[PDB]
Design a protein around this nucleic acid. Structure first.
Ligand SMILES: [Mg+2]
Ligand SMILES: [Mg+2]
Lengths: 267, 94, 300, 94, 301, 267
DNA sequence: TTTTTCGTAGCTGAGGCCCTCAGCTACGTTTTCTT
DNA sequence: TTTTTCGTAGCTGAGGGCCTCAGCTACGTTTTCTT
């Protein structure tokens, strides 16, 4: 799923090709055939012609924050492909298919196989234990005073520095994960572990890779103890997303998770 | 009878008081009331006759698309503009 | 220092506005159209269900973001007024709604119940007993040609069929533009109700399948007669007057008010309840904020 | 749905634009629209939350005696006054 | 540089406003109430049918002139809210109206037809055949005491008859007095606006407000007195304010201002006679009357 | 019959008496018993107590211009006496009573009896003649260029100077005549010669005395040719009204005119 | 006895409020979902 | 190959529009009705 991030300039059409234009002239040539998805970062302006071309070749436009740390708008709202959405939905609706998917997700979380066949609620218990344990481990590795995960969903300024950092990091992660889910052509609202939230599926997928990179960075920045912690975490997450191709590697993971249903994928 | 709003700017004290005869002034130059069509037209002829160098906009409630209509007298940087029948406000550059 | 921005119900909104000739920016958190000379024109984006961007417009990142946050659909159209592209919130905000729609669409018998209801609402009577979806679609083809002929003679407009080249005659241009407006507000409504435009019952496998279904239910009740009226009036520039006519017909027949209930009713004919969350599922950690807008739009 | 008028003074650009989301600005600080009760209350909490040092008056059409009602936020020389249930405006001395 | 000021229809107006504690002036052609501290309060005088001046008010010449020009009746009231004095345009603007009323009032048989109509409108049925005006007045006395008793029992208020002191009585009588005062206010306003003389009545006669008494008595028990009893049972410290609010509400709910002029016109119409045409020997009108947006009795331009 | 003009001050009550008060203290004591009618000229302010007293003793308040050259508002609107209004109305309604009244008006106007019983339309003709003759006579006595009575009821400024003067003078006259009619307790709208106007009766009475004083002064001032003619005419009329007791002698005339009906007056 | 006294409109200059913008700097952000 | 480029919010001082008032002067007047 080829994609490009565009920033600081106007997206226009020249000779049937996508073009990014500055005061300095043509900044970036994009052949129409080479991109399935265009991510528009802040400071972009879309010409009508660009949109018309994108429609003609069926290219997804996604208005995002930097590096995709935020998703704000999407072309083709609700998804453009029936078969993808129906694949996801069929997986979510059938008890055994759903169970296969959930077990795969948990296995990806645990490394390799969750226990043979004891229930899901019970797996959620294990995962809770492991998550708290991981918080403690990172807390000791980076040397940060840790009194548990605590935050007020209504007042951002009450928890300690490390909790602000964690929250901001996970926020950015939810950004790129939503981006990837949209690029794959699925609905963020339809999840398997999480349900009943606009980004349940995002939470499902994000929790799989949450602790490899960005939460550790939350801890690192937490110990560095800067003037503006949350902002440093956001920028750091942006940098990590750009350097380590997070969005690019998120999509195979998603497709794998769903593939575990042992039902065949579309085109 | 429907709700009426009259907004005056740089208008003589004569017109200020004259509007105060029928309407309630809630801020300087901003009058609110509730009048019938015919009374609204008479008030408008009062405005057109007494505004002099000043400029006025009048908006009233209707059962049309947007729920209200408005019309102006004199020059203002903010002037009405037509978009396929929807009347909005254009803000002219200095 | 800051307060969240949320969508308002679709019924409370003006149907649509067409914007052309300018760059669309954000100033002090407001949607603004600026032209070559510097003339600003503020557009109450939250009070509008659908914004139509015509050729020669250039939309800033901030503007698109803003339009999404208040749940206003942006629709890029070419001229002859045809819908080209659309932008809005990434998707439905409620899992159960989407799973409801998908479950209805995937099961043939349920699908059939929904289609039968669509037929009843569209034509004014029950579809004949014992018919598949393709046979119902056949019946619909017949009746549709009958309706085109009838309108063609009532308004007295020469009718040689539905024809267009990606140009057509006046009645076809008018039909294309009117239908475009209808697809605009209908897509808006479908997204606001919290459903996917791509998952349809009569039309399928197309990016706007459900839009086609729902729109076809009220199309000849609403926008096409007006297209014929204007066609007979024979204007220089059909599209603007088609816009005015469509706005008027939408307001008079209270379309925006009835679109979400219509959708909900159509789906309700499946005789099934939107699926409850699995008991094995992880409970919602942070409760959804109560919203003044429609169920499908995101809030806070 | 009923007609709405909001008049702001010395209010931050934040609130000016925020109001411009739903209402039409016909003069500086003067906004006109047509909204339901609940939306009106929401706009009011937007005003109460964003007006800061400024002051605002909001009037809307009703089925009451005078055809409309109005309420204020912040201090202004023109302030509402009650006369046996009829609400008028008192103009305070300097 | 100048544009005339004219009255607007009575139906389009707020019924009444009570003013107290201050001097009433004109500023830039507007009616204004100013208190001891300098606080101004503009009164949309044209939008009001009746302005009530309580004790402690002082009205400038310009204010009275202005109130007359827009055809707003000024009514000076004492405490307990009783009407004391009134001011407005010098009189009816139409000759034929006044001559119509007078011709109806002077002829016994026409007068009787008008009174019979009043009776029908008031009680809900035809008066008995062949009754004189005084006999109808007797019937009305009886029915009125019956109505006071009925309201007294519905609202549960002790009723020992209609009693008042000239500077008192029980709460219910104070309330009745204030309410009735409001009704007489708007009714005098209506009578003047329709273009008739308040002094020329049919049931009550020889009194400065005879016609006012007639017309008001037609709707009094339909409107202001029940509300007087309601407030009476509520037992407030100072009834008059609560009575004012209650009367405004009842006037608004039962569309009193809208129905007062038609009521009058209908009452007089029962005489089955047309307002007299100008004599053919009369001097023709040299300058045509200006078309008016207001009611027929008020002067224009 | 008695009346007083009050000017420049506040009307209050002291010791049960009407009082006119300025900054210098009590300006005018008015015993309550001595006035039937109070004429409030510009610059007056009425206390509530004064009004209350006036109601108690049944005194008519009349808001007027200076010297009564304008009438603006009246207490007891519509008239306070039934018998007066009914007297006037009965006179106006009965063909022959009206006829006697009209005939008396014309005789007072011509100065001694109108012809045997020439009809009313014929009298209107004869007097039209007399009026034109009087305009001409005054025009030669005061030596003013006279091209007839001409004026535009919609544009005050297109007639000649003398027509403006005539109009302003008659205007003031209509003022005091209305004042007198109100003081007598009659309705200005119900006239005998003129009908269908709010001031028909005013025109009836005013036309009787019009040419004795104020029209000649209109001509005098016209010949003086001042900067502001209409204003000088108004002031001159005010002075004439104050000095010559015009309002006071207007009332017996009115009562006589009506008395000509040979029907009995009230109290 | 020589009692110019009151209420209101027009005019102008002083004072002050606040809208509007140019010009500069800082920013890509209003988050948390196995607490 | 060393490519900082775009759109928008916050801030502040300059310019200016217009509301408000004190202080002064002039005024009692927006008419005509047998043209
Ligand atoms: Mg179809
Ligand atoms: Mg009685």
């Amino acid at each position: 799923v080829s994609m490009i991030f565009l920033q600081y300039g106007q997206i226009d059409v020249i000779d049937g090709a996508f073009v990014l234009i500055d005061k300095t002239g043509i900044r970036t040539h994009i052949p129409v055939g080479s991109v399935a998805c265009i991510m528009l970062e802040p400071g972009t302006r879309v010409s009508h012609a660009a949109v018309r071309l994108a429609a003609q070749v069926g290219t997804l436009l996604v208005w995002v924050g930097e590096a995709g740390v935020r998703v704000y708008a999407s072309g083709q709202p609700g998804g453009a492909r029936s078969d993808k959405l129906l694949y996801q939905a069929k997986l979510a609706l059938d008890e055994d298919l759903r169970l296969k998917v959930v077990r795969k997700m948990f296995e990806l979380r645990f490394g390799e196989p969750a226990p043979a066949r004891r229930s899901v609620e019970q797996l959620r218990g294990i995962e809770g234990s492991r998550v708290r344990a991981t918080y403690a481990l990172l807390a000791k590795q980076y040397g940060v005073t840790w009194n548990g995960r605590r935050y007020d969903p209504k007042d951002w300024e009450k928890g300690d520095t490390i909790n602000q950092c964690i929250s901001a990091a996970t926020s950015c992660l939810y950004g790129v994960t939503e981006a990837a889910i949209l690029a794959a052509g699925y609905a963020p609202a339809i999840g398997f572990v999480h349900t009943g939230k606009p980004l349940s599926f995002v939470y499902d997928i994000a929790d799989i890779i949450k602790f490899d990179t960005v939460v550790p960075k939350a801890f690192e920045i937490a110990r560095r103890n800067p003037g503006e912690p949350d902002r440093e975490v956001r920028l750091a997450c942006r940098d990590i997303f750009r350097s380590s191709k997070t969005l690019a590697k998120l999509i195979p993971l998603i497709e794998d998770v769903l593939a575990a249903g042992e039902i065949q994928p579309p085109a | 009878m429907s709700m009426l709003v009259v907004v005056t700017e740089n208008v003589p004290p004569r017109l200020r008081g004259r509007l105060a005869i029928w309407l309630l002034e809630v801020r300087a130059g901003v009058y609110v009331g509730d009048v019938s069509a015919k009374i609204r037209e008479m008030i408008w002829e009062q405005i057109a006759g007494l505004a002099e160098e000043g400029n006025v906009v009048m908006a009233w409630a209707t059962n049309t698309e947007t729920g209200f209509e408005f019309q102006t007298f004199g020059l203002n940087r903010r002037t009405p503009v037509d978009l396929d029948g929807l009347r909005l406000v254009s803000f002219l550059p200095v």
